Amino acid sequence: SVMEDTLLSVLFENYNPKVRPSQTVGDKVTVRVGLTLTSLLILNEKNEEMTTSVFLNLAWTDYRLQWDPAAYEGIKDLSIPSDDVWQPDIVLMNNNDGSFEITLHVNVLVQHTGAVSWHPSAIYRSSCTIKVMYFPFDWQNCTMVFKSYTYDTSEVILQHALDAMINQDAFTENGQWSIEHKPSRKNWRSDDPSYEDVTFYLIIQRKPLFYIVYTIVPCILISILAILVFYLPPDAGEKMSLSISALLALTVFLLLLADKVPETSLSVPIIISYLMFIMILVAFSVILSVVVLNLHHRSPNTHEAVEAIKYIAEQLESASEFDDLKKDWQYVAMVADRLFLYIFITMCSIGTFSIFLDASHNVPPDNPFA
Amino acid sequence: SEHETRLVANLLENYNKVIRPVEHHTHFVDITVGLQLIQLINVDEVNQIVETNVRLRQQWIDVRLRWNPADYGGIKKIRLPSDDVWLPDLVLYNNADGDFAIVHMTKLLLDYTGKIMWTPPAIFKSYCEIIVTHFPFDQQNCTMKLGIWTYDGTKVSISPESDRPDLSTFMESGEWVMKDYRGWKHWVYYTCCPDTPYLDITYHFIMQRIPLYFVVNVIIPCLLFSFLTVLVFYLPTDSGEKMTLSISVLLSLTVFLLVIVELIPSTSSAVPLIGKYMLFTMIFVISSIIVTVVVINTHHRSPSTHSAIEGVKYIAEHMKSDEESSNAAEEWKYVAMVIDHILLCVFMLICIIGTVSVFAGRLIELSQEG
Amino acid sequence: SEHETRLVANLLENYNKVIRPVEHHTHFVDITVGLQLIQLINVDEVNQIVETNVRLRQQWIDVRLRWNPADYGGIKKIRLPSDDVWLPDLVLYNNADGDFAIVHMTKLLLDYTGKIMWTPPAIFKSYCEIIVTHFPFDQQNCTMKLGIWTYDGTKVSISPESDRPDLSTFMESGEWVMKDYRGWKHWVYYTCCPDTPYLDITYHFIMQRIPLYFVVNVIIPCLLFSFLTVLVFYLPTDSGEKMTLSISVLLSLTVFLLVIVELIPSTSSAVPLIGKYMLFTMIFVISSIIVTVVVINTHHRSPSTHSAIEGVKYIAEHMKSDEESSNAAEEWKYVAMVIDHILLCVFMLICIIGTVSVFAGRLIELSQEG
Amino acid sequence: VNEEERLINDLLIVNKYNKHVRPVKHNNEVVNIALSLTLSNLISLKETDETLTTNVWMDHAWYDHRLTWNASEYSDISILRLRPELIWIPDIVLQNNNDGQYNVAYFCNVLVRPNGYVTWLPPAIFRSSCPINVLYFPFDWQNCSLKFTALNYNANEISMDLIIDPEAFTENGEWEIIHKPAKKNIYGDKFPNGTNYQDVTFYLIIRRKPLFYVINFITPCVLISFLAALAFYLPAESGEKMSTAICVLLAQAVFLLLTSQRLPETALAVPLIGKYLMFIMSLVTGVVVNCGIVLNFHFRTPSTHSGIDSTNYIVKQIKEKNAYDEEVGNWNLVGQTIDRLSMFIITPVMVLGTIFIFVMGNFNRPPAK
Amino acid sequence: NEEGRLIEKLLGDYDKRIKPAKTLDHVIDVTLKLTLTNLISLNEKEEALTTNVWIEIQWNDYRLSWNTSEYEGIDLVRIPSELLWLPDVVLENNVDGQFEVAYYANVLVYNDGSMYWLPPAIYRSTCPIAVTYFPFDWQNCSLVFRSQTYNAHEVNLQLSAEEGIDPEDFTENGEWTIRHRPAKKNYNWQLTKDDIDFQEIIFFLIIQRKPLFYIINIIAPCVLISSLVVLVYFLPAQAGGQKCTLSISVLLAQTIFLFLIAQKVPETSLNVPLIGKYLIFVMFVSLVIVTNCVIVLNVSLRTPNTHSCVEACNFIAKSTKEQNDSGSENENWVLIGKVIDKACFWIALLLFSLGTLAIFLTGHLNQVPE
């Protein structure tokens, strides 16, 4: 009773819905912003698009809602729909690639002397620079800048919790990636009067090892038929034609591979590294098989009286066997041996190279997890 | 205090939001547009659709918003939310594919005098020419008109604000590149009606396309195929033993050319390139076609290639000799003298066609690169 | 005039729309519903989705709408805005995949008495069985039940009105054809609860599907592939000298149909059918494989066809006689006789299992055709 | 008329009743709220990303003490309707599966009992991120956990107490629903200094995998394998089909490669385990290897891959001489090795082929354990 | 000039949902017209389209002719949507999607009570293009639209030219073309048996398409293909013995290519419309290509196999010569190529005929509808 109807009344009599919990132009209302992440569902590492979900915990004080006996001293804590406070119509300078879901228009926790607690989980369409640099083992970092899209920091100050909180705090276990750390730094670019956005850093690490495995098999298994086509010559010289069949076959195979590679990066591309040199490794088996094909080509051919008849017989046979013996002199196997071992150098050299680069790529550019 | 409540309430009462600050029958409501694309998110030259960042600077005056010491004296310039304002139905003429995004419920600023600005952070859906003339090396100028939508120059007039580039905030992630962009004003009166119609801002986007990755993959299997067909020439004249062997290649390669066709027309369908680009491939690819068919039909062009005891000896020797003849006949079929002709016949052809393909390639690259 | 203001004012005060014209503890609200289907713009047999239009002919009564010379007298039948009506949350039980569209904001039929109807040109997306047994020749009857959503019998009741076909306005551009369409009513009380539950209209769509496009191309490559198989068998007789050639065409054949089955899975899962069907193709074609298995295995089935001066004349003709009986050996295996049994053996067996394929295929359509 | 005008004026739902005020008899323990979960349908499953679109009947109950009516409300009709904005509605949040706001399970018509007890239960088209993990593929196919409850209120403003999942499991799913337990609870946490919001915890333990991919996929293996199997039987019956035998490698090779290509395609659409994916590609490689083996083994050997008297002696010389050539080749033939090859092809096919369904079983036995 | 009082006067009596109908037996005079401006999506196989229509709306309601303070002030007024009778437009046969931006827009009230309004609308529709619209003779797109609310005994729509156009702003990036746009104003009475006519707006659109790009992709390949097979056909006479199988390699290659085509463009017609006539020539000119193609191997399949001590021994050896000669003789009577050579000219003129039959007829199906 103690002026309850009175209080109650006066409050709703004088209280202003559309007003800011501050008095004039000054230090403003110090709103607390801090989100405990739920998990993330889709990383479009290719366009640098980020759809995650977290809690929008906001909290500041409404010294305009401090109650009295019944709602203050009666029930120190009571729930009341928002819709009555300035809400950070927050957009993300890079990210905020789309609207809020479970972000605004939801109830809030209002304390006795005016404290306000609003904890809503939400899904948000963002876009961070995971750029086409989300695959190097050295990976990269990003700028996630949150802030309102009609308000300018003049009638409120934004403030954070931790900066180490981490993003693996609610990292998706469903992620083909991994994370090292999440930096959180408060910002106010001076290119705009409006103090604004906060930059949040993603020192992301995404190592999904699954198909590069059977990709290796081509390179090496194709090599099987490759070393084979380079081995088949002094193995079965008649490989002559069958050889060409091999490369038709070998080339179509690698071209189909050419088919799956562009359409697969089509959703998760970054630096060429792997492709850069396998591209070379490609060109390598490609041309090596084709010049060996020219190795194959280079051969212009390969690619008394009684006794007289006898004598005429003696000369017939012998005469042309030298001729076909000439073909021997012409297609001997010197090259095959020499370049099948130049094949030895080439393929085992260029092989242990990307082997190496790849080797160097996973270990060397790994520690910049920062 | 200072007429506190009397101040605020009076203002609400006699003021109709929907009213347009019409001032006598003349100048119309003078309202100016000023678009600053902060940045672009994505574009589809094929479907000529773009999602872009726009901060619309909208200006106009409402002499009804002028004040005295009890509104301007309170705090010079202040923040009043939109609603109460008459929002020009802005519209991109041949564009407009989408609603202005974040135009709604934003705020504006009123001066001690009245002058108001409405500059809400937009990003929207666009629709501009690309025609099959945008992907050219010689580009096309995206004609984009902007201006008042349902009001005439007698009720209202949209005017421009300034010059500024489109590559000022052009997307570096675009598969295209900018030349220049200009925008000049205009008033459109129609021979239809004797009346004076709306005003408009006309954008002109002059940019040339094609990211270079494409460039390399395609022309190299061509010089690739060039060498196999090059081999298609040299293989036969230096070795007609694997004519059919090459039969294989002819199959494996035009099919390679066939499947490359699925890939690049979808590219074609993925990105609108001026068809006159297509003829490059047309004759080029098709000569691979006319040349083969002749080269290999010719490759193919050849009939079959692609005392008494003493007398016994002479009836027998005579048998060996006319078959001797016969052998020479079929060889008199596959000569190695003109396969050399076709070699230089066409290689000059290829160095002609090729250098002719390089011709227009080089030529308008003498125009584009400029 | 005629109690002008007194008549419309009184009507608004003591009139309510939230309420339903409940009349004592009995038959519920007499709801008369029906389908008036005149267009089926889009449907997918695969996902069993149907976006059609049916004017929702509703018919029921509310005495409160009865009038005298001051509303009936005004103009017999008057049409009132639907708002005043309690609109049922009708919905497709195992369907309802979409909102009804165009029902809101419409006209309502009122009578001097009270009779009322409102046939809304409702268009919506539906969801009913088609399963893999949707498009056979023997059809399936999509069970479509419709009735009040969240209201039980104790408050509202609906009932059929008339029988009307489904083909009355069935799509002549449909990839299907109708046979019959029946709709009877019922009330569903459940063993769960002792209560008397909602009423509903159950439609059953009986119609056979499948254009003949997929059909023409399944069988063409079959007969054509049976031509090459037929060649498969005949060649060893007319050209066994190309058994290897045969091999090539089996790599050919095999890849082609292995690729044919690729199409199937895409198309089949892209357009629904009862698996029992592909079973036909399965063994029939594994039959060409099982048979080429044996036939070419059998085709390759064979070991390798897959004085003293007087003295040497004798060592010599000896040389010749040894080899001659020897060449007789390889021909001893390629007897050119079993080759004719294999094509006839299988020609009959393919003419028979083909006629077998032909059998259930036609039997099933001597069932469908019906 | 029995005080009806007056009484609903007494309740005035919106005006007299505090709809923005939840009748929890003021600050105390809580309003006894109860949630009931019944899945009406499961339309889409995404095993790979642990996401599910499913329909639920959001059966809700709580007593609205200000809702109790009198004769011309209560007894006039011991049951009546009242919209959401005129009925207190729990703010049920799908705790770990509402990362996709609820549809038409929102502000819907509710049921008004006579003595305040109210009943609101409409349909929920929802999306969830259930505990798939890369362990939602072994045969147990995990247990999908979900919690439901009134999000906003705590343990002194709300108490929610507590149906099979296969009750409305979708029959067009590529999986199988084995069980679905239901038990409510309430729980505070470390950073919170007080207990609150009670919830409906419903675990769904399921299983899935086709008996169809097995069909057309192993099918080609014994068919293809017989080719490679015959491959070694065929080197005997007629190894002379050198080039043509070579053709088949190209051909059995191109077949092999994109077969594996279709594999990841459906793979990405499905998080496949490492245990199974290897037996597939391991064994096709077994043939791939032996195709390469086929190569060499099929082309591996170096070669198989007195005057009148004077004259004819010349021929007997040329005779014998190239007879040495002729034979230098059969030296290479290596034919008494033939059977052992295809015998030691049989043995291994038996070894590995068995090793797989041997392993098939050694893991087929323990789950059935 | 009573400016305030007048506004306030009518608003007193101002009636919303009531039509400006003098009385009830002669309806109001409603004017409408549409100027096409965007034909956004042509999915002819499903008969649907999306267009930005200028909905020129006009009618009369002197319920607000004004005085000196509003009529005379300015013979022009722009008053909000929700403030006068509004035609809820829709295309009977087409509009399958509620209008977008076609309503809720500023209307126009001159001074005598003339009302003008014109919102732009992007919406979906379903015009003809039913197993026809792909010819050279075009199916006239007939769209009739009217208010879907009331019927012509109270409402009456007007129109204008029914002779003059759809190509007014027919899109230049359409894969088609328009040649005429007729439009009639009419009453309501359809096949379905509806009475009380509500007038509507008929939209004829007989348009052309088929600007083939795929034509020569189809035309040069087939010639290359025909030649390829004619290679198969004449190349044999030129080709060596190792060519029978040579020819085969081509069949394999020829149809690998073939059904790949069969898979390529069939896709084409499913994503876009369909028609069988043009379809018939291809597959059957294609099946004949295949036919004489396999016929060829069956042709290069046909033929039987081409697919004193001194003297006693001199006697017998002179026999192996004549003996084997009889054998090589075999070859003769077997491979005397009467059938083959003639097979070249067989397909040749047959080629000319298949071609002439087809392109001559394509000449016709372009020339009758020309």
Curated annotation (Swiss-Prot), chains B, C:
- A single Pfam family it belongs to is Neur_chan_LBD
Membrane topology term reads: Multi-pass membrane protein
The UniProt entry's coiled-coil ranges are none
Keywords noted in UniProt: Cell membrane, Disulfide bond, Glycoprotein, Ion channel, Ion transport, Ligand-gated ion channel, Membrane, Postsynaptic cell membrane, Receptor, Signal, Synapse, Transmembrane, Transmembrane helix, Transport
> What is the designated name of this protein?
Acetylcholine receptor subunit alpha
CDD domains hit by this protein: LGIC_ECD_nAChR_A1, LGIC_TM_nAChR
Q: Which gene encodes it?
A: CHRNA1
Subunit composition? Pentamer of two alpha chains, and one each of the beta, delta, and gamma chains.
- Could you tell me the superkingdom of the organism this chain comes from? Eukaryota
* Compartments (UniProt record): Postsynaptic cell membrane; Cell membrane
State the Gene Ontology terms under molecular function.
Answer: acetylcholine-gated monoatomic cation-selective channel activity; transmembrane signaling receptor activity
Q: Which GO terms describe its cellular component?
A: postsynaptic membrane
Q: Which residues lie on this side of the membrane: Extracellular?
A: 1-210
Q: Main location per UniProt?
A: membrane
| Disulphide linkage map | C128-C142, C192-C193
- Function according to Swiss-Prot or TrEMBL: Upon acetylcholine binding, the AChR responds by an extensive change in conformation that affects all subunits and leads to opening of an ion-conducting channel across the plasma membrane.
**Glycosylation site list:** N141
Q: Which organism is it from?
A: Torpedo marmorata
Write out the catalysed reaction: K(+)(in) = K(+)(out); Na(+)(in) = Na(+)(out)
